Amino acid sequence: PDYVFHRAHERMLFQTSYTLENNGSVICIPNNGQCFCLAWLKSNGTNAEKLAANILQWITFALSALCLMFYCGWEEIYVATIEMIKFIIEYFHEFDEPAVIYSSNGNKTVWLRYAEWLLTCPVILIHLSNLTGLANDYNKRTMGLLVSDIGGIVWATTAALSKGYVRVIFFLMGLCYGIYTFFNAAKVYIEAYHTVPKGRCRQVVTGMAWLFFVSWGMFPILFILGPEGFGVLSVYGSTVGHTIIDLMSKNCWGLLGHYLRVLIHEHILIHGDIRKTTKIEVETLVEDE
Amino acid sequence: PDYVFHRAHERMLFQTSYTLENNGSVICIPNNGQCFCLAWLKSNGTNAEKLAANILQWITFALSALCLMFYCGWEEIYVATIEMIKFIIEYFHEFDEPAVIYSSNGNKTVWLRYAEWLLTCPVILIHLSNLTGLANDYNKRTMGLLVSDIGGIVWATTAALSKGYVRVIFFLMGLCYGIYTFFNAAKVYIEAYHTVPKGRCRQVVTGMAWLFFVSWGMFPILFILGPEGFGVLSVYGSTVGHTIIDLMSKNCWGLLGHYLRVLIHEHILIHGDIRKTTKIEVETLVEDE
Ligand SMILES: *C/C=C(C)/C=C/C=C(C)/C=C/C1=C(C)CCCC1(C)C
Ligand SMILES: *C/C=C(C)/C=C/C=C(C)/C=C/C1=C(C)CCCC1(C)C
Ligand SMILES: [Zn+2]
Ligand SMILES: [Zn+2]
């Protein structure tokens, strides 16, 4: 349990024992083959934040667990599986390399976070490209949606690994990739709203859109606030924030998507698949001929 | 120029000055806020390998440059743009953090490499999903192709960042993702061969398949041979090997793909788009009605 044992075994992760010499101008270290850096030893945050972070992580785990049990809708169960495995990794080695990368420039990069984005964010966007769940076509801009998002994560990760101005450059690059994703994602939500049958289906689509842009928009904000930004948030506080928006973006958004797909399925089962062309061009599900 | 200046300015990257004390049981270091690790100071390889690596990198750069000039075929120019930007980054900061990640466990992980895979490999697979270049449909297993590949890169990167058995676990996980990609990719090449018109088009498809599986299969092999494996290859030697198969997988494969798409285009322009159903189900381009 990393929540209990990290302070104990972090001595084995890297060098934590050192002696200051010559009025603090010299650091002396056991020649034991371990890497050393004072930056790595700095606090992750307060105990209150640490506690708050640990609570929400259990909640997400149970949420993901119940959702998995509850659950083609392969995209919904895939992200839940990743989220579950993530907690298992968090539970035992949250601040152990390389779940946290302690690099030579002093940075502490949460690779666990960025690796998860790589696994779940493209899948979420694939779901977005097929909100109705009807085989087999996707939008014309799904490939562009996927490429812009993966790139954005690469730039965000690279920005986190960097410092100073090079961090700024790769952040701004991720930002450019980000506006491309959102504009494309928005056009997908718009068409979806007019593709689904009028009624409750159009409500959840509106709800999924709100859940999407709010939650996803919070991530670059937290980046700026976190240790990889201007350090107003601790790494414990950064964890709290990410967990909250992980809840919205993956768990809640996934439930609504599944719920939306169920409604579509029951509709087509009852009324048949009947399309009315709407002016881009959209084939809208209707009830009567 | 990192090829010339790295030995000079690596003093500013991390601590390179230290004194052994007490019969080599104590290392003493300037208290200057820099990270220290003997593992980081180890040689990248021989000058012969370094020279060989630097030559092939220029070649790829010129190759990518000429290909860009030479060049919807958006996927071909996207990887060439990335490859060009990659060289520019290589030229100035090849062994500077975080192009190389110097982590607290002593590892030297080539993030530049893995970040590039994230950017170019999904795009290559998207191209693979649309070898004919005809709008707008892709295969049924493209989403599975993309997800399996991204995951595999995540596990490979995680494996490189790790050591010992956890490195082995994430390698084997990437391996499982890998066989999924190859089996799916193979089925795409098979259908493609029977979809394209009989003649030269079926030759290049066979050639692209050979280029694909040989080049892509070499990457996990080089992982095992490299510093992230059993260290038979130096980091300079690892660079040489990757550059050679970067040539095949991105540049050469991209040319053949573009060439294939040109042949398809000229065929449909001359003979029209005429399909004959072949038994999965494939709509085969033919010349006569
Ligand atoms: C479930 C996890 C999700 C949905 C994570 C999403 C992450 C982003 C939308 C990240 C965005 C960016 C940064 C953190 C920094 C650079 C700018 C962005 C937009 C690429
Ligand atoms: C242009 C660059 C390319 C095509 C890179 C491809 C990289 C791979 C196919 C990597 C494969 C793997 C490892 C390096 C280790 C774990 C096993 C694999 C298959 C995921
Ligand atoms: Zn720990
Ligand atoms: Zn350098």
Side-chain angles (χ1 to χ4, degrees), chain A residues 13-14 20-21 24-40 74 78 82 89 93 97-98 100-106 111 115-116 118-119 122-123 126 136-139 142-144 146-148 150-155 157-158 161-162 165-166 170 177, chain B residues 13-14 20-21 24-40 74 78 82 89 93 97-98 100-106 111 115-116 118-119 122-123 126 136-139 142-144 146-148 150-155 157-158 161-162 165-166 170 177:
Chain A
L13 258 59
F14 38 74
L20 288 173
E21 303 297 325
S25 53
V26 179
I27 293 188
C28 286
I29 285 145
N31 190 15
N32 67 158
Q34 286 193 294
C35 299
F36 175 85
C37 197
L38 288 180
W40 299 341
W74 65 269
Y78 184 88
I82 299 297
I89 294 183
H93 307 92
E97 197 108 25
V100 173
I101 303 183
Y102 303 82
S103 56
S104 58
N105 58 18
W111 172 241
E116 182 206 19
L118 252 9
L119 298 166
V123 171
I126 289 179
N136 191 26
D137 285 19
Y138 298 88
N139 297 71
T142 77
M143 300 315 165
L146 275 4
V147 168
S148 65
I150 301 166
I153 302 174
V154 175
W155 311 134
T157 301
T158 305
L161 296 167
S162 296
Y165 69 93
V166 50
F170 279 106
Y177 270 58
Chain B
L13 258 59
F14 38 74
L20 288 173
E21 303 297 325
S25 53
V26 179
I27 293 188
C28 286
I29 285 145
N31 190 15
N32 67 158
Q34 286 193 294
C35 299
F36 175 85
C37 197
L38 288 180
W40 299 341
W74 65 269
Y78 184 88
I82 299 297
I89 294 183
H93 307 92
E97 197 108 25
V100 173
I101 303 183
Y102 303 82
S103 56
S104 58
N105 58 18
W111 172 241
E116 182 206 19
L118 252 9
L119 298 166
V123 171
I126 289 179
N136 191 26
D137 285 19
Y138 298 88
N139 297 71
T142 77
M143 300 315 165
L146 275 4
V147 168
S148 65
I150 301 166
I153 302 174
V154 175
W155 311 134
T157 301
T158 305
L161 296 167
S162 296
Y165 69 93
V166 50
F170 279 106
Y177 270 58

Side-chain angles (χ1 to χ4, degrees), chain A residues 193-197 199 201-238:
Chain A
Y193 177 88
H194 287 77
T195 303
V196 291
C201 285
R202 296 195 167 191
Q203 296 189 253
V204 23
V205 166
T206 293
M208 291 183 58
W210 273 103
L211 253 196
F212 182 85
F213 293 106
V214 166
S215 195
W216 282 53
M218 275 300 300
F219 288 94
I221 297 181
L222 290 196
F223 187 104
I224 300 180
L225 298 177
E228 346 80 41
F230 301 110
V232 15
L233 300 173
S234 60
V235 343
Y236 285 146
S238 184

Side-chain angles (χ1 to χ4, degrees), chain B residues 194-197 199 201-231:
Chain B
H194 287 77
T195 303
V196 291
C201 285
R202 296 195 167 191
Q203 296 189 253
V204 23
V205 166
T206 293
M208 291 183 58
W210 273 103
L211 253 196
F212 182 85
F213 293 106
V214 166
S215 195
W216 282 53
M218 275 300 300
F219 288 94
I221 297 181
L222 290 196
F223 187 104
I224 300 180
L225 298 177
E228 346 80 41
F230 301 110

Side-chain angles (χ1 to χ4, degrees), chain B residues 2 5-6 9-10 13 92-96:
Chain B
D2 194 74
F5 279 70
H6 182 64
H9 63 207
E10 94 146 321
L13 258 59
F92 291 108
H93 307 92
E94 171 143 350
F95 300 108
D96 305 333

